[PDB]
Amino acid sequence: VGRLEGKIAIVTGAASGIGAVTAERLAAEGARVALADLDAVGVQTLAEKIRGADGTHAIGIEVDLADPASVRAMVAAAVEEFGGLDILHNNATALASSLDVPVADADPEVWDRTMRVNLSGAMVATQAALPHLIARGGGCVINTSSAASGDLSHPAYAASKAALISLTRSVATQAGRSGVRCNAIAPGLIITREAAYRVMLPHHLTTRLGRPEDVASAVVFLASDEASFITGQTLVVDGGLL
Amino acid sequence: VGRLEGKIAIVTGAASGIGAVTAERLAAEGARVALADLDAVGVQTLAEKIRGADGTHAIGIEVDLADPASVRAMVAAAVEEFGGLDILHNNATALASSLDVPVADADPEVWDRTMRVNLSGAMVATQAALPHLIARGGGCVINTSSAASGDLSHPAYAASKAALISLTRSVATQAGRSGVRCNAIAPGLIITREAAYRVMLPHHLTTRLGRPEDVASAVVFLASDEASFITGQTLVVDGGLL
Amino acid sequence: VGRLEGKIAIVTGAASGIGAVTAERLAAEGARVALADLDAVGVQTLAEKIRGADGTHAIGIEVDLADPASVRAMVAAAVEEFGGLDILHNNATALASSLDVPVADADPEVWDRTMRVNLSGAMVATQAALPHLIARGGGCVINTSSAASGDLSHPAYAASKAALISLTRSVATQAGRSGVRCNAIAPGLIITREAAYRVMLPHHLTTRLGRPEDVASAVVFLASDEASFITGQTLVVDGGLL
Amino acid sequence: VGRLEGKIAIVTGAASGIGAVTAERLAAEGARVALADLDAVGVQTLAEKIRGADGTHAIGIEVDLADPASVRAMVAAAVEEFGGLDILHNNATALASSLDVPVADADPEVWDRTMRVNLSGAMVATQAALPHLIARGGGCVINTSSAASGDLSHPAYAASKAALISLTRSVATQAGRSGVRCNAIAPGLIITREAAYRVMLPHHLTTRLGRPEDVASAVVFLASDEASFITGQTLVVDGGLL
């Protein structure tokens, strides 16, 4: 009945927002889920809520995406727990984005830090996960950039998003023969109070603004067997914002 | 329980191949379906199979996608049968394909005929369907190009596919304010016996070739409520063949 | 001294606008030029201006891009006049544009007519020109879409422009082995009095609006020997209007 | 007579290959040129050869693209020398690329270092140059990724190339109102002994492989006034390699 029944998945950035909603959605579709995030407590709590009092199908793992050794330890603990791996969901912070100013005032350190976490983190996680995906007989990696007058600011986020798309194509090309798919999702304006943002409505093509469930549904689709002929692709989930 | 419960869909080119498998899939997902194609008997026969001896949730209609008047009659008889419209699936032949030779030998009449059917047909169908979609409270149009040596031949087919993608964006932009989404699916090599095409497997990223069910699954996802924040997009379903 | 010394070029749509300015520019860069358009007198008059009273390096030919036979006669009379061919510039109206309404009201006959002229015309011209380009030792075809509210209207024009880009790639792929390059130019808002359009200036990135000379300069670059490693490409000349 | 007469340009990575050929080409087109590179001696020597015994129109400056303060000092020394700035050409190493292995064996440190130099370097240079371009009444920045079965390896170079394209669009968007254009060039296989590579010929669409002069000619075009209506664009110079 679950669209991901019997699957094992890792979800990074799982303590809040898109990651948290996705992590609950994969589990509700029958996936066993390792939730991973900087915030140890936030991810243990969510894991506990997903498990309920009877369940064993979720675990919370502490990870620092900027630390390759921490990223490798996380993938090993998840494989250890559930005995394998089918899905890796790499997830990309208000002040963080507040620091990502236009090029004229941009701080090179914020760029360096942004690439380290958003690109180098996903790359290392992917590299750690690949042999486990391959031994499973195949599986998939799904890269989600963070939620997006977008070219007018946050250029480091824009640059890392484009880099992540290139990583996605690199991995799909390199791992395809071994049965691994790799796809990206590029969310537009995702509201994690929808009423305060309604000025943005005429700039969308849809009649509503984005929800984290929109990204989660896309992750369920791309992770499922019925999408197994899709790889190297970027699914834009943005209500037409462009 | 079905992922498309209570919905009403039109599928053109539904007598065989991808259109046929998709039409069966939408009905299996709980949609009421109007099947349209040039081949009248073939479409009633399939409508009859989907329906069963005592069912009513599918109808077969004869349509000529080249003739605007025939396309408009088909949309009206679909709505007249089921009382509304939620989904329009425009689906774009071996002989016809053999006539689509490289540019050096290309016949302008083949190009003309190709645009009339693959492009104008989809535009007119879309035009006819739009007010019914809008009155329903919104809905979606899904344009499926025909399945793909790539650019080395079938240039009229490739031209019309790019044109179809432009139509998809034109419609998503123009109709989005009224609640209509419009997306495209670009299938790669789809096999509607896999053995004869094994030589193509190293050209793919994935370890298998495509099936009409791959396109049908993408149509179910894009036609469903949990994909309602996606519009103006092209989903390539090609196993990486590029 | 000219950047196109000793070269022979065909320019279609050369009676007015972009075609006219481009034809003058190629001749000023030292090319011999066959000017082609529906408007016979307008094209001889301009050929006569370029030529001067005692010159021979330009000729005006009457062509109907909708009729394959007329297009083939034009290519042959161009080659017959100058003894060879190096460059074919396919150039794609206010009334015609006013007929290209949004999809809701679109007329299929306008779409048909648009593909016949903008697409099939360019394909047939290209087809006719190819063996002359190949025999010359190589050369190039440059396809120029018509100048751009964007997707909100003129959908037949946008469809045919995407189709033209696909044709450009089809031809670059198929003819590259024989030494022929094929590229496209996509002009944005081109003014062929800038004052009436000042409202458009905030929509642009650049501080001025476009001029036919902007498209002509891109054609000189793409037609020249120092651009011979560029093929299959679309150069957008739109001041950032997107 | 020069196509860049009276212009002041900076060229980074100017000690060898594409940078060196471009730097000589801009000067031959009448530009005053500050050549900048890690290799102090290689850039002084080339500057000296461009100057001849009579000239003053070139200078060699030592720079470390990974060091923001060094990048800022370089832009100031160039402005100091020539009294202004019109063009910034940011240029992206055999062992360097030898270290950029497929994802499965990728070193996160090489990724970090690659982004620091290729992306953070161009960003800082651009940021340093912008007020000087703007005070000049406008000008342009041209970003060139390094020369490219390309997705099969060098993924960090691929990722930084995509990021650089995003930087290009960010800058074009942010600086456009102030009269600055920003464009990217994406070279394919550029041979800096053409005979040892001829196995690659059937994978190209052209009849020859790339030369550094192909990139230089593209830089001359994009830097010139007759390209002033082009911004935010990526010119692919790859003979069809794709």
Side-chain angles (χ1 to χ4, degrees):
Chain A
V1 192
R3 295 167 52 199
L4 295 171
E5 200 62 59
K7 299 272 159 54
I8 303 166
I10 290 172
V11 182
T12 71
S16 53
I18 295 169
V21 170
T22 303
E24 289 191 66
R25 184 63 191 286
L26 306 190
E29 297 297 346
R32 289 162 279 160
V33 186
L35 294 78
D37 207 321
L38 190 64
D39 176 20
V41 174
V43 102
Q44 297 298 336
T45 292
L46 190 54
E48 203 173 359
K49 170 182 168 278
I50 294 165
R51 284 198 304 272
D54 54 300
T56 52
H57 57 289
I59 59 161
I61 315 173
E62 183 178 354
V63 66
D64 178 13
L65 250 47
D67 184 342
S70 174
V71 171
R72 283 164 195 143
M74 181 268 285
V75 176
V79 164
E80 171 63 27
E81 180 71 18
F82 296 125
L85 185 64
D86 299 288
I87 304 157
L88 171 58
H89 184 197
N90 292 308
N91 260 283
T93 182
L95 192 75
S97 62
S98 98
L99 292 166
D100 190 4
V101 297
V103 167
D105 293 72
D107 182 344
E109 286 283 16
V110 160
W111 280 58
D112 301 344
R113 186 51 157 194
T114 305
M115 294 302 145
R116 276 177 61 74
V117 177
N118 294 340
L119 182 67
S120 244
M123 188 282 277
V124 174
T126 300
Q127 170 193 76
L130 283 174
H132 298 280
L133 296 175
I134 293 168
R136 193 78 162 164
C140 71
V141 182
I142 305 165
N143 298 144
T144 309
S145 55
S146 163
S149 151
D151 263 5
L152 286 175
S153 186
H154 309 329
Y157 148 86
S160 72
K161 167 180 164 177
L164 198 58
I165 288 174
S166 166
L167 169 69
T168 298
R169 297 171 174 183
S170 285
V171 172
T173 304
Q174 293 165 15
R177 42 200 165 106
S178 301
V180 187
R181 283 103 56 199
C182 187
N183 292 290
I185 295 166
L189 170 60
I190 304 302
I191 296 318
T192 21
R193 333 300 308 219
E194 307 153 326
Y197 285 67
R198 53 169 118 185
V199 125
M200 288 306 237
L201 284 180
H203 305 148
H204 283 67
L205 291 177
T206 53
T207 49
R208 63 170 178 93
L209 303 175
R211 299 184 274 247
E213 294 82 3
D214 297 305
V215 172
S217 292
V219 172
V220 171
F221 172 66
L222 290 177
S224 72
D225 288 337
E226 58 180 6
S228 68
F229 199 62
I230 302 180
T231 195
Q233 297 316 306
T234 303
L235 189 53
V236 176
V237 182
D238 81 331
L241 179 74
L242 301 167
Chain B
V1 38
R3 288 165 54 193
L4 294 170
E5 265 310 318
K7 291 186 181 309
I8 302 160
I10 292 166
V11 185
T12 68
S16 56
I18 290 177
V21 164
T22 296
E24 285 178 281
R25 183 62 189 282
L26 305 193
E29 293 296 353
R32 286 162 283 165
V33 184
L35 293 83
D37 210 334
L38 190 76
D39 172 17
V41 182
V43 92
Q44 335 263 25
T45 294
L46 182 53
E48 191 178 347
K49 192 185 165 223
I50 292 157
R51 232 158 42 216
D54 291 306
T56 65
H57 61 289
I59 187 187
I61 319 171
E62 181 180 6
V63 66
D64 188 347
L65 288 179
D67 169 67
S70 170
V71 171
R72 289 173 187 137
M74 180 272 286
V75 167
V79 165
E80 164 74 16
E81 174 82 12
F82 296 123
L85 189 59
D86 296 283
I87 302 155
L88 165 68
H89 182 200
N90 295 127
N91 224 133
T93 318
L95 200 56
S97 185
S98 75
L99 294 169
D100 192 358
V101 298
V103 166
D105 286 277
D107 174 349
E109 289 170 59
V110 163
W111 282 60
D112 302 332
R113 190 177 313 116
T114 302
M115 301 309 136
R116 291 205 74 223
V117 179
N118 288 345
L119 181 62
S120 276
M123 186 280 280
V124 177
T126 297
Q127 180 180 76
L130 274 176
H132 297 282
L133 297 177
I134 295 176
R136 185 83 162 170
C140 69
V141 181
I142 302 158
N143 297 141
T144 302
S145 68
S146 207
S149 62
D151 284 339
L152 283 171
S153 191
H154 310 322
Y157 149 79
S160 78
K161 172 188 172 181
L164 204 68
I165 289 180
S166 171
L167 169 69
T168 296
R169 292 167 177 152
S170 279
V171 171
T173 301
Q174 288 163 15
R177 75 168 204 271
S178 314
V180 180
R181 290 98 63 193
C182 184
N183 290 288
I185 297 169
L189 169 51
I190 307 299
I191 306 296
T192 64
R193 57 280 105 196
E194 224 241 35
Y197 290 73
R198 288 174 71 183
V199 290
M200 292 303 294
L201 215 29
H203 271 90
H204 288 69
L205 295 178
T206 58
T207 52
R208 72 171 173 91
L209 304 179
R211 302 141 185 179
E213 292 77 9
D214 294 310
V215 171
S217 291
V219 172
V220 177
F221 172 67
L222 289 180
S224 70
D225 294 338
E226 61 186 37
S228 58
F229 200 57
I230 304 178
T231 188
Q233 295 322 300
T234 298
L235 185 59
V236 181
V237 180
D238 81 333
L241 181 78
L242 248 78
Chain C
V1 38
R3 288 165 54 193
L4 294 170
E5 265 310 318
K7 291 186 181 309
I8 302 160
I10 292 166
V11 185
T12 68
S16 56
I18 290 177
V21 164
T22 296
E24 285 178 281
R25 183 62 189 282
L26 305 193
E29 293 296 353
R32 286 162 283 165
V33 184
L35 293 83
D37 210 334
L38 190 76
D39 172 17
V41 182
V43 92
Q44 335 263 25
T45 294
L46 182 53
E48 191 178 347
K49 192 185 165 223
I50 292 157
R51 232 158 42 216
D54 291 306
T56 65
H57 61 289
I59 187 187
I61 319 171
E62 181 180 6
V63 66
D64 188 347
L65 288 179
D67 169 67
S70 170
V71 171
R72 289 173 187 137
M74 180 272 286
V75 167
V79 165
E80 164 74 16
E81 174 82 12
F82 296 123
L85 189 59
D86 296 283
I87 302 155
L88 165 68
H89 182 200
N90 295 127
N91 224 133
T93 318
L95 200 56
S97 185
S98 75
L99 294 169
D100 192 358
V101 298
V103 166
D105 286 277
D107 174 349
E109 289 170 59
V110 163
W111 282 60
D112 302 332
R113 190 177 313 116
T114 302
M115 301 309 136
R116 291 205 74 223
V117 179
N118 288 345
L119 181 62
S120 276
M123 186 280 280
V124 177
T126 297
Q127 180 180 76
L130 274 176
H132 297 282
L133 297 177
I134 295 176
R136 185 83 162 170
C140 69
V141 181
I142 302 158
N143 297 141
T144 302
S145 68
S146 207
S149 62
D151 284 339
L152 283 171
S153 191
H154 310 322
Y157 149 79
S160 78
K161 172 188 172 181
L164 204 68
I165 289 180
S166 171
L167 169 69
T168 296
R169 292 167 177 152
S170 279
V171 171
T173 301
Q174 288 163 15
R177 75 168 204 271
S178 314
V180 180
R181 290 98 63 193
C182 184
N183 290 288
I185 297 169
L189 169 51
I190 307 299
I191 306 296
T192 64
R193 57 280 105 196
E194 224 241 35
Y197 290 73
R198 288 174 71 183
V199 290
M200 292 303 294
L201 215 29
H203 271 90
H204 288 69
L205 295 178
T206 58
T207 52
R208 72 171 173 91
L209 304 179
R211 302 141 185 179
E213 292 77 9
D214 294 310
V215 171
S217 291
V219 172
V220 177
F221 172 67
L222 289 180
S224 70
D225 294 338
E226 61 186 37
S228 58
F229 200 57
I230 304 178
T231 188
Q233 295 322 300
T234 298
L235 185 59
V236 181
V237 180
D238 81 333
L241 181 78
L242 248 78
Chain D
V1 192
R3 295 167 52 199
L4 295 171
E5 200 62 59
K7 299 272 159 54
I8 303 166
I10 290 172
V11 182
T12 71
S16 53
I18 295 169
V21 170
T22 303
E24 289 191 66
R25 184 63 191 286
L26 306 190
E29 297 297 346
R32 289 162 279 160
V33 186
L35 294 78
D37 207 321
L38 190 64
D39 176 20
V41 174
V43 102
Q44 297 298 336
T45 292
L46 190 54
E48 203 173 359
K49 170 182 168 278
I50 294 165
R51 284 198 304 272
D54 54 300
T56 52
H57 57 289
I59 59 161
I61 315 173
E62 183 178 354
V63 66
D64 178 13
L65 250 47
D67 184 342
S70 174
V71 171
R72 283 164 195 143
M74 181 268 285
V75 176
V79 164
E80 171 63 27
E81 180 71 18
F82 296 125
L85 185 64
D86 299 288
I87 304 157
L88 171 58
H89 184 197
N90 292 308
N91 260 283
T93 182
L95 192 75
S97 62
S98 98
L99 292 166
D100 190 4
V101 297
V103 167
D105 293 72
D107 182 344
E109 286 283 16
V110 160
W111 280 58
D112 301 344
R113 186 51 157 194
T114 305
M115 294 302 145
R116 276 177 61 74
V117 177
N118 294 340
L119 182 67
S120 244
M123 188 282 277
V124 174
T126 300
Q127 170 193 76
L130 283 174
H132 298 280
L133 296 175
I134 293 168
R136 193 78 162 164
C140 71
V141 182
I142 305 165
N143 298 144
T144 309
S145 55
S146 163
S149 151
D151 263 5
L152 286 175
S153 186
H154 309 329
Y157 148 86
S160 72
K161 167 180 164 177
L164 198 58
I165 288 174
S166 166
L167 169 69
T168 298
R169 297 171 174 183
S170 285
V171 172
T173 304
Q174 293 165 15
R177 42 200 165 106
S178 301
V180 187
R181 283 103 56 199
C182 187
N183 292 290
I185 295 166
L189 170 60
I190 304 302
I191 296 318
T192 21
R193 333 300 308 219
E194 307 153 326
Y197 285 67
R198 53 169 118 185
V199 125
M200 288 306 237
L201 284 180
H203 305 148
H204 283 67
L205 291 177
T206 53
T207 49
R208 63 170 178 93
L209 303 175
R211 299 184 274 247
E213 294 82 3
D214 297 305
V215 172
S217 292
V219 172
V220 171
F221 172 66
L222 290 177
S224 72
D225 288 337
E226 58 180 6
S228 68
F229 199 62
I230 302 180
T231 195
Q233 297 316 306
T234 303
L235 189 53
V236 176
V237 182
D238 81 331
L241 179 74
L242 301 167

